Curated annotation (Swiss-Prot), chains E, F:
Species of the source: Homo sapiens (Human)
Family per similarity comment: Belongs to the beta-2-microglobulin family.
Name under which the protein is recorded: Beta-2-microglobulin
Glycoprotein among keywords: yes
Span covered, complete protein: 21 to 119 of 119
A single cellular component GO annotation: lysosomal membrane
Length: 274, 221, 205, 9, 99, 99
């Protein structure tokens, strides 16, 4: 299948302080590989993968400037938006940008992205075309037509289809061992009686990568979206993920409930029963 | 590139004689020692015998002295293991391995490649139908019951319940090879404690080697 | 002549596993280690106490001092599930001495104690002049159990057969243990018990 | 590789 | 506008008493970014605790993972305390062996 | 003016595993009178706890004793948490077998 690269930028205005706190994190698929923290004493884009510090000082130096600068702009932008929204200096507001690119199985270009959000709400975003912007609210339009003047539509496209993809390609090959793995889920089932008449059949799936996973409970081969509970996939802290899906069962009917697990690194879908 | 290929194993009967051969490629066979290491299925590794680079001497483990003889043909790049008066104890897989260091006058150092090996199984073989006895559930939660498929030969038997109409709770276990040389297998299906009685319980064991099919209905008490 | 390995070792993925091969003055012998995955031949992983072959990763290190040789696996991967045998040459024995073997289990499940289901001899088998006690052991992990039979608080040696553990559907392990008796011996004693031990704890019926 | 320059609102 | 944190507390590996594991507290789906997280060994604040770098999800809600090396026993019971702007009093989520 | 509480945690009788003893937390020398004291069976708040009635010493400093029935083992570790106006974060004094 495909692969992807995403960078996440967050800037939170500190009331009373100049430089807001800035955090930038870079992922490939589901493996983080770079970090930049305003409050870090490093003040340099640090490595967070095993395969990334094989890039020389030409890389880390440019990457630091690249988001030293990205932070600078957010400083000014946090103030510009403070005017667009008639907001006082005593507040704390967040600006979130996420941009990246998706390659196909043959290194082909598939999709580009850039989305900006002010205070957790959508602000401006780049359309599928990579030729158009869509503004969430009023203010974002006064930014939108400003970007339409400078052809920000195009110039994102020259990053997404140029240097972004060549990076994702160069990363997927340099860290080919870490990034192109598949990790089948290590599964097991749990039986917890709750009443004298009901229990809970929990379906575990630990240690898998990528995080894409499909858990399905089924009664007599019929899908059971009713008494089902599904926690969102949790990171185990070692680059792999966990997820469990439970169902409430009337006693003496556990041999009727079947848990189904689908994963990319799994050859045939799983089936689990008590 | 170094390849070892065992052969000559199979199914033998006690008292007979059997010859294993290990074909070698990928090194000057005339310069290395060779070893036989056997492993009874489900057991650890056990050294059998070994032979120096030329065949001068012949090292034997004590369990196989007098009955086994290890030889080699340097002109053929072949290691041989001769077994005389086969016994049920000799049933094991026989690996052949090549001494890593050259010119060793005695088999002291590690064995670097190992062949995939050959399997030697001896028994008083003759095809037999399996006797089916009902494993009734405990009259005194979850209730269990099943079938006992005793003393068949050779493998395998297949057990189904109600002609395959029951699969939930069904579990067939591996067969033991009792000291008689005949296999023995059980297969039970755990069910709900209550409600056993209403359902019709028939396990259908099928032993194709003897062309036997047995349908035994199980019932409590 | 006597080199003893633990029966099984369980370790969390990515942890450091450690398998020992204890023996009298084994520190003065040359220890080797072989790894055997199911259905294949052994593979040399450490030779002469600490040396690694070409293909073997540097995570695996050897050790041998005093009276205990030690195989050390740092940053355990899932593919390391296999049996591990140590190798010495007893100079004063003319015998190459393999260890008992250690089944290293890298757990994906939690650990489950075994479920024991014991059957008395059926009435049909008793009228066939035989009696066979059926002990069924299922749903344990890792797959390492030991079975003992007790006829009235007394051990039972011969007449006992026990299967090798095997993976179930849910990748827990299961095995069975049979005790062949004469119909008289089943009636001689007042009670029979099947004792299964798994990871230090013992379960019985 | 992060983007060369940035946009102001 | 504000979003309140989801909290899951779990071990990295299936927990076994006496074997070194890792205690994870995974807070997700919250907004804004200011959050306080501690790990608790029997009501005591665990000091050797680190966290992940602030990333966010599709709905722009942030997520962090706080982790500590720990060796669980059977009587030692651990928990995770999380204060937020959406929380008047800190929530505490105690670690269950099977959740 | 304020005084900060001293905390002593001890058992009523010399503790022996499997025999019913009583867990004492004795706060003394504090001012003003408002104090919160809990007993902890492995970090959880033990509910069946009573306390003594508020008396004071020569220097007008109050003292209380909170006690609970408990059967100590070797794995169970008990403790006493005492919050005060002079205490920014709750003090915790765990019950020692030889103190």
């Amino acid at each position: 299948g495909s692969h992807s690269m995403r960078y996440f930028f967050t800037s939170v205005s500190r009331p009373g302080r100049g430089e807001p706190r800035f955090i930038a994190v870079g992922y490939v698929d589901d493996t983080q590989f770079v970090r930049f923290d305003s409050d870090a004493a490093s003040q340099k884009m640090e490595p967070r993968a095993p395969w990334i510090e094989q890039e020389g000082p030409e890389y880390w130096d440019q990457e630091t400037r690249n988001m030293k600068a990205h932070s600078q702009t957010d400083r000014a932008n946090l103030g510009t938006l403070r005017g667009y929204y008639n907001q006082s200096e005593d507040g704390s507001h967040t600006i979130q940008i996420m941009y990246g690119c998706d390659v196909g199985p043959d290194g082909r270009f598939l999709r580009g992205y850039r989305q900006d959000a002010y205070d957790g709400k959508d602000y401006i975003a780049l359309n599928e075309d990579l030729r158009s912007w869509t503004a969430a609210d009023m203010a974002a339009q006064i930014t939108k037509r400003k970007w339409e003047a400078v052809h920000a539509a195009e110039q994102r496209r020259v990053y997404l289809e140029g240097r972004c993809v060549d990076g994702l390609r160069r990363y997927l090959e340099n860290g080919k061992e870490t990034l192109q793995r598949t990790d089948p889920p290590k599964t097991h089932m749990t039986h917890h009686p709750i009443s004298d008449h009901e229990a809970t059949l929990r379906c575990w799936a630990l240690g898998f990568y990528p995080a894409e996973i499909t858990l399905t409970w089924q009664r007599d081969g019929e899908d059971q979206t009713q008494d089902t509970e599904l926690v969102e996939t949790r990171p185990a802290g070692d680059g792999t993920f966990q997820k469990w899906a439970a169902v409430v069962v009337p006693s003496g009917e556990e041999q009727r409930y079947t848990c189904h697990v689908q994963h990319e690194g799994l050859p045939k879908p799983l089936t689990l029963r008590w | 590139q170094v390849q070892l290929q065992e052969s000559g194993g199979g199914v033998v009967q006690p008292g007979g004689s059997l010859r294993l051969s290990c074909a070698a490629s990928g090194f000057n066979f005339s310069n290395y020692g060779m070893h036989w290491v056997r492993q009874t299925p489900g057991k650890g590794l056990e050294w059998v015998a070994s032979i120096p680079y030329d065949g001068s001497h012949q090292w034997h483990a004590d369990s196989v002295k007098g009955r086994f003889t290890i030889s080699r043909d340097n002109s053929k790049n072949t290691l041989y293991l001769q077994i005389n008066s086969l016994r049920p104890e000799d049933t094991a897989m026989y690996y052949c391995s090549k001494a890593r260091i050259s010119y060793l006058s005695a088999p002291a150092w590690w064995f670097d490649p190992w062949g995939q090996g050959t399997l030697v199984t001896v028994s008083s073989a003759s095809t037999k139908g399996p006797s089916v006895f009902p494993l009734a559930p405990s009259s005194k939660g979850t209730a269990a019951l099943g079938c006992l498929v005793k003393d068949y030969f050779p493998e395998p038997v297949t057990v189904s319940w109600n002609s395959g109409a029951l699969t939930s709770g069904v579990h067939t276990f591996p067969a033991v090879l009792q000291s008689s040389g005949l296999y023995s297998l059980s297969s039970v299906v755990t069910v709900p404690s209550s409600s056993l009685g209403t359902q019709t319980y028939i396990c259908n064991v099928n032993h194709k080697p003897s062309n036997t099919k047995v349908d035994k209905r199980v019932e409590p008490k | 002549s006597v080199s003893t390995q633990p029966p099984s070792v369980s370790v969390a993925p990515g942890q450091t596993a450690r398998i020992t091969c204890g023996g009298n003055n084994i520190g003065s012998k040359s220890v080797h280690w072989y790894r055997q995955k199911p259905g294949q031949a052994p593979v040399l992983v450490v030779y002469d106490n600490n040396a690694r072959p070409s293909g073997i990763p540097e995570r695996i290190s050897g050790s041998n001092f005093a009276n205990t040789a030690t195989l050390t696996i740092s940053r355990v991967e899932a593919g390391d599930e296999a049996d591990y045998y140590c190798h010495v040459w007893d100079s004063s024995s003319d015998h190459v001495v393999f260890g008992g073997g250690t089944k290293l289990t890298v757990l994906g499940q939690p650990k489950a104690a075994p479920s024991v289901t014991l059957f008395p001899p059926s009435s049909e088998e008793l009228q066939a002049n035989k009696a066979t006690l059926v002990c069924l052991i299922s749903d344990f992990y890792p797959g390492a159990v030991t079975v003992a039979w007790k006829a009235d608080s007394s051990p039972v040696k011969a007449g006992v057969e026990t299967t090798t553990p095997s993976k179930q559907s849910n990748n827990k392990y299961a095995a069975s243990s049979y005790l062949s008796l004469t119909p008289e011996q089943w009636k001689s004693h007042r009670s029979y018990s099947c004792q299964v031990t798994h990871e230090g704890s013992t379960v019985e019926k | 590789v992060t983007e060369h320059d940035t946009l102001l609102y | 506008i504000q979003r309140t944190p989801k909290i899951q507390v779990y071990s990295r590996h299936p927990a076994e008493n006496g074997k070194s594991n890792f205690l994870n507290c995974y807070v997700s789906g919250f907004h804004p970014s200011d959050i306080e997280v501690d790990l608790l060994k029997n009501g005591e604040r665990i000091e050797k605790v680190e966290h992940s770098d602030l990333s966010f999800s599709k709905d722009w809600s942030f997520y962090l993972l706080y982790y500590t090396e720990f060796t669980p026993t059977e009587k030692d019971e651990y928990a995770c305390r999380v204060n937020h702007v959406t929380l008047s009093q800190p929530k505490i989520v105690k670690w269950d062996r099977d959740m």
